[PDB]
Design a protein around this ligand. Structure first.
Ligand SMILES: CC(C)(C)NC(=O)Cc1ccc(Nc2nc(-c3ccccc3)nc3c2S(=O)(=O)CCC3)cc1
Ligand SMILES: [Ca+2]
Ligand SMILES: [Zn+2]
Length: 345
């Protein structure tokens, strides 16, 4: 196929894609059967399922041309922040959009924006933190004044690529649509910057305290401000959903991010940086740092999300608690979480 699917596993892929609308889709199998084109292959599936191609007159050719281009701007050598992660965040956002509490809430344009935002949110990620780029006086850091450095970059590159030959998937939108989508996308990607987590969660907390549903139990959002707030927390949840997938999947994610963190530690050493060495793979405690990560970041976010969508996210929340318990059981320089927390300042 134009996708990279051999006639061999075209049945394998279709069977894996039967769970396109599920939390337990396995995005790794999708990349195996697509020749490492998971982002393009899953985005195509998502757009078909939602009938977004026809709603917005994005021809297949334009969509595939843009997606394929987008996906090549992810770096396959970066262990976690590659096209598989982006594939996963998009597939995950696709599911969160369809939870019954969010049944008919969002316009097609809002759905288009959320999922697009998920696909581009990490494009051209060099595999290092914002703070690394800051401390090295990276051109990117200078360009965005050390503020949401990479998040700004992802947005820049994701829009830039619309301009390549037959890559403008938004060309048949009206001016008004394009301006609304853009503003929403910008707002969701910047919302994936971790130093904004706590302020993000502090507003989601509020939203829940005065939430209303229809007689159908569909959450009620009557002005742009509310919808974009839900949308941006949705994307950030998606971004932080690894620990809520099946233990088998979660551990693969953790393995990947730890490789990327350690690979960052090697660059810090190599380049002789700021005397404050992070722990290496012998000296770190990865398990302890996970439980630290889930208690401090992941669970408080997911618990508040589950509140908003009561009881839609319960199986998610229970799987989170099971996984926290598994990492918990496996527990025996500046540590991972110490380095994480210190660099929020
Ligand atoms: C901590 C440094 C290295 C400075 N990095 C950052 O601030 C950027 C950053 C990038 C990704 C994460 N995302 C993740 N971060 C962690 C983690 C964070 C701090 C201490 C120990 C672990 N674990 C996981 C993830 S994940 O859900 O992606 C995969 C599953 C486990 C957090 C932060
Ligand atoms: Ca990011
Ligand atoms: Zn991400």
């Amino acid at each position: 196929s134009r996708f990279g699917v051999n006639t061999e596993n075209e049945d394998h892929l279709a069977k894996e894609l039967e769970d396109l609308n599920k939390w337990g889709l396995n995005i790794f199998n999708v990349a195996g059967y697509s020749h490492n084109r998971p982002l393009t292959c899953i985005m195509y599936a998502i757009f078909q399922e939602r009938d977004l191609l026809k709603t917005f007159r994005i021809s297949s050719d334009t969509f595939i041309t843009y997606m394929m281009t987008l996906e090549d701007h992810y770096h396959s050598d970066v262990a976690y922040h590659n096209s598989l992660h982006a594939a996963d965040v998009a597939q995950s956002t696709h599911v969160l959009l369809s939870t019954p509490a969010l049944d008919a809430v969002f316009t097609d344009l809002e759905i288009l924006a959320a999922i697009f935002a998920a696909a581009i949110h990490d494009v051209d990620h060099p595999g290092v933190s914002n703070q690394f780029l800051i401390n090295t006086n990276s051109e990117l850091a200078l360009m965005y004044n050390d503020e949401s450095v990479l998040e700004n970059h992802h947005l820049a590159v994701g829009f830039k690529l619309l301009q390549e030959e037959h890559c403008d998937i938004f060309m048949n939108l009206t001016k008004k649509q394009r301006q609304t989508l853009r503003k929403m996308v910008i707002d969701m990607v910047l919302a994936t910057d971790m130093s904004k987590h706590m302020s993000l969660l502090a507003d989601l907390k509020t939203m829940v305290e005065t939430k209303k549903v229809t007689s159908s139990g569909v959450l009620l959002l009557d002005n742009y401000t509310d919808r974009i707030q839900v949308l941006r927390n949705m994307v950030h949840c998606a971004d932080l959903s690894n620990p809520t997938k099946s233990l088998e999947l979660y551990r693969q994610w953790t393995d990947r991010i730890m490789e990327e963190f350690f690979q960052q530690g090697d660059k810090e050493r190599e380049r002789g940086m700021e005397i404050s060495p992070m722990c290496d793979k012998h000296t770190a405690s990865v398990e302890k740092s996970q439980v630290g990560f889930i208690d401090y970041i992941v669970h408080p976010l997911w618990e508040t999300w589950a509140d908003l969508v009561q009881p839609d996210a319960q199986d998610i929340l229970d799987t989170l608690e099971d996984n926290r318990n598994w990492y918990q059981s496996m527990i025996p320089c500046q540590g991972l979480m110490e380095k994480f927390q210190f660099e929020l300042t």
